[PDB]
Amino acid sequence: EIDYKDIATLKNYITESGKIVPSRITGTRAKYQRQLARAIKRARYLSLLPYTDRH
């Protein structure tokens, strides 16, 4: 149920520089971590999330 349009939820799993946080830090399952990575990449494409802190 992870949606790339849920930026409020996706921002909890990215650092201050926009990088995805590892599953060891947030303690999320591997399956939902993969879903989160896919959703974050899609949201980066739609310019809803930044690729980096620069641009």
Partner RNA sequence: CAAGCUUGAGUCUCGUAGAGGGGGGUAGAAUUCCAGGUGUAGCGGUGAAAUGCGUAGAGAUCUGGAGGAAUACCGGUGGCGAAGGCGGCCCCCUGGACGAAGACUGACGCUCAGGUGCGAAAGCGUGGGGAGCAAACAGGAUUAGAUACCCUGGUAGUCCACGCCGUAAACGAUGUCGACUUGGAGGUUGUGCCCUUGAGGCGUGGCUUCCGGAGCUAACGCGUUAAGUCGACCGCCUGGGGA
Partner RNA sequence: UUAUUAAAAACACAGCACUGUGCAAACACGAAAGUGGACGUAUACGGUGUGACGCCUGCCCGGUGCCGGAAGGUUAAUUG
Q: Which residues bind another protein (CB under 8 A)?
A: 3, 5-8, 15-17, 42, 44-51, 53, 55
**From the list RNA, another protein, none, partner contacted by residue 23 (C-beta under 5 to 8 A by kind):** RNA
**From the list RNA, another protein, none, partner contacted by residue 29 (C-beta under 5 to 8 A by kind):** RNA
Binding site for RNA (CB under 7 A): 15, 18-24, 29-31, 33-38, 41-42, 44-45, 51-52, 54-55
Residues in the chain: 55
Question: Dmax of the chain from CA atoms?
Answer: 30
Q: Which residue in 46, 33, 55, 52 sits closest to 7, CA to CA? A: 46
The sign one gets for the Cα dihedral 4, 9, 13, 19 is positive
